[PDB]
């Protein structure tokens, strides 16, 4: 709260023109003591020799065997991260995958990918798994690219029904400035270019995408050490039979960002494809929708308190509205909704997993899209509208929406089950004496394609209402 | 200056007179900066320059208006 240590007392407590004899008479003698040399990025711009010197300093401090002829160029001591832009395993690679993103002045993919792969490819193995198994898993991670190309060739209609939704196939190359990924999110009703307008496949970098990783500690499962199955399969794809197979100390542990709530049936079905289930811990069987809505809307949420308390009031096409969530409500099913509040994504070798992941992905996507209507709208005591509805998840992926239909003097529910991955069932149940306020399969498929609770509410209030 | 601090660190942790050269360069830079001429801050200088430009424009317009309307005999 003062500035008396800059020019008033700084130069007076430094213990001129002829008092610079401190280079040879008083010289008889980078983390938290010497910040001058550590702040090379602030004194000078990020250049070739500056980064090469910083890398060498970090290697000498933390401990990493690496050197060169002189200062001005430095490689990366790893399995295959050795690449000099502009031999103990693989040869010197100069592919564009690690030259495009870091061409001229990039400074992001220089201390995260390297450190990431170093932390991942680190274990108690001494020259037996730190390098051998790492290279084996890196080489084995190439059949998916051939499988991706085969899926792209087979699905020559559009990259919307096979790449993102339905099944896997929206993959990209995992090298340098881009790691392995997949189409986890499948939000089709986002802000599009007004089925994205692209020349070729997306590298899962333009916008938002998940992050798939390959690491493990005790999941030493039998897997190949080289790509064998590479021929074009009959219709969609073919498996790769291994076992030339050793106990490779690695796995396919991805990075699940949010604890998406799933069903017990999906986890039980997936618990028979890759050994054990997708999580080994105490299952947090708490209200699934309650925590899932907060986890999903937590991105946009600001530091201001919300305090919804199971209130799902939201807006409308031209007014305000309201809704519920039926959270923490034990249905006739008996036990409450199973919760999967965990971040363990420790998978196993790519065995019979052609649909072991896509089903749970579609389930989680439908669950998210259900609570999509409540993201940041906070408006209570709305006398007008207030199309309150309670999604009753009695069965797995089975929702219901109640609306004050003018047909009868009561609410109007409709069974909303996710039959397909994007074509959900939107049937409805009317009354013995009720007007035809129930739309046809046209509006049902429209709402299915929309997959938004607020969209359905607006449709009921505008199209189905007709009043 | 980044180069001055770099030379100082080099001369300090190399085991020449980088400090003398740095001081000479700093004195030369200070002399070149003071060579401009504007002793006071450039804020009032720019204010006075804008005022003088406005006054010159007004005087030119007045002279033009005076030398234009010449219809007497």
């Amino acid at each position: 709260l003062s500035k008396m240590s800059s020019l008033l007392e700084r130069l007076h407590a430094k213990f001129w023109s002829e008092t610079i004899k401190l280079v040879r008479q008083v010289m008889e003698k980078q983390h938290l003591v010497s910040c001058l040399e550590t702040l090379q990025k602030a004194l000078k711009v990020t250049s070739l020799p500056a980064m090469t010197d910083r890398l060498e300093s970090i290697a000498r401090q933390n401990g990493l065997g690496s050197h060169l002829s002189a200062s001005g160029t430095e490689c990366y001591i790893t399995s295959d991260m050795f690449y000099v832009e502009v031999h103990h395993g693989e040869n010197p690679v100069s592919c564009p995958e690690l030259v495009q993103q870091l061409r001229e002045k990039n400074f992001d993919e220089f201390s995260k990918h390297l450190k990431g792969l170093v932390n991942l490819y680190n274990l108690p193995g001494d020259n037996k798994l730190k390098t051998k198994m790492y290279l084996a898993l890196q080489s084995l991670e190439q059949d998916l690219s051939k499988m991706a190309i085969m899926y792209w060739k087979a699905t020559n209609a559009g990259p919307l029904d096979k790449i993102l939704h339905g099944s896997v196939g929206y993959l990209t190359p995992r090298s340098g400035g881009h790691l392995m990924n997949l189409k986890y999110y499948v939000s089709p009703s986002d802000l599009l270019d007004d089925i994205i307008l692209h020349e070729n496949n997306v590298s899962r970098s333009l916008g938002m995408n998940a992050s798939v990783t390959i690491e493990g500690t005790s999941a030493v499962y039998k897997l190949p050490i080289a790509p064998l199955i590479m021929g074009s399969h009959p219709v969609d794809n073919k498996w790769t039979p291994s076992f030339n197979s050793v106990d490779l100390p690695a796995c396919f542990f991805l990075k699940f960002p949010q604890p998406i709530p799933v069903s017990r049936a999906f986890v039980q079905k997936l618990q028979n494809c890759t050994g054990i289930p997708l999580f080994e811990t105490q299952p947090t069987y708490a209200p699934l929708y309650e925590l899932i809505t907060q986890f999903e809307l937590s991105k946009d949420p600001d530091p201001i308190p919300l305090n919804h308390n199971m209130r799902f009031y939201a807006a409308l096409p031209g007014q305000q509205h309201c809704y519920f969530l039926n959270k923490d409500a034990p249905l006739p099913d008996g036990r409450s909704l199973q919760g999967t509040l965990v971040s363990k994504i420790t998978f196993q070798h790519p065995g019979r997993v052609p649909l072991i992941l896509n089903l749970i992905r579609h389930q989680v996507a439908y669950n998210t899209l259900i609570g999509s209507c409540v993201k940041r709208t906070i408006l209570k005591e709305d006398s007008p509208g207030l199309l309150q509805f309670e999604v009753c998840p009695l069965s797995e992926s089975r929702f219901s929406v109640s609306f004050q239909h003018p047909v009868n003097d009561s609410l109007v529910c409709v069974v909303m089950d996710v039959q397909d991955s994007t074509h959900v069932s939107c049937k409805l149940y009317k009354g013995l004496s009720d007007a035809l306020i129930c739309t046809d399969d046209f509006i049902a498929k429209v709402v299915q394609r929309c997959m938004s609770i607020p969209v359905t509410m607006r449709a009921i209030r505008r199209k189905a209402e007709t009043i | 200056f980044l180069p001055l601090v770099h030379n100082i660190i080099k001369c300090m942790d190399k085991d020449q007179d980088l400090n003398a050269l740095k001081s000479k360069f700093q004195e030369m830079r200070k002399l070149i900066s003071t060579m401009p001429g504007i002793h006071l801050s450039p804020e009032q200088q720019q204010q006075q320059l804008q005022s003088l430009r406005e006054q010159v424009r007004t005087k030119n317009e007045l002279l033009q208006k005076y030398k234009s309307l010449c219809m007497f005999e």
């Binding site: 800059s6 020019l7 700084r10 130069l11 430094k14 401190l22 008083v26 010289m27 003698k29 980078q30 003591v33 010497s34 001058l36 040399e37 | 200056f1 001055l4 601090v5 100082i8 660190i9 001369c11 300090m12 942790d13 400090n19 740095k22 001081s23 700093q26 004195e27 830079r29 200070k30 900066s33 003071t34 401009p36 504007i38 002793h39 801050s41 450039p42």
Partner: peptide, 27 residues
């Protein structure tokens, strides 16, 4: 702009001397 420039030069020289002393006492 003479006083401000001289003060800036003096502060820069003091900072450089402090940095050199820290580099000599640390490394």
């Amino acid at each position: 702009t003479r006083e401000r420039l001289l003060s800036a030069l003096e502060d820069l020289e003091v900072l450089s001397r402090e940095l050199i002393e820290m580099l000599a006492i640390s490394r």
